[PDB]
């Protein structure tokens, strides 16, 4: 393939790496929210009781 076509495929691969990172961050948000919700619905009411 040409040098141009190689740089092009190199940059799709990099974008796909960023997209996987984007997905991973999305799930980090989910994990942190799960922690927040667990604290507010399980820990906090327990201490309140």
């Amino acid at each position: 393939r040409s040098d141009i076509e190689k740089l092009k495929e190199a940059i799709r691969d990099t974008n796909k790496a960023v997209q996987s990172v984007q997905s991973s961050i999305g799930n980090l948000i989910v994990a942190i929210k799960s922690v927040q919700d667990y604290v507010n619905k399980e820990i906090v009411p327990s201490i309140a009781r």
Partner: protein, 34 residues
Amino acid sequence: LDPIDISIVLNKIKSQLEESKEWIRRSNKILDSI
């Protein structure tokens, strides 16, 4: 006790993620034109 509320920061991250996705969409659209 007052609940922990990090919604302000989580919503901010969600917003920056959408931006990140738009830039990658734009990058790929340009690459498609080659």
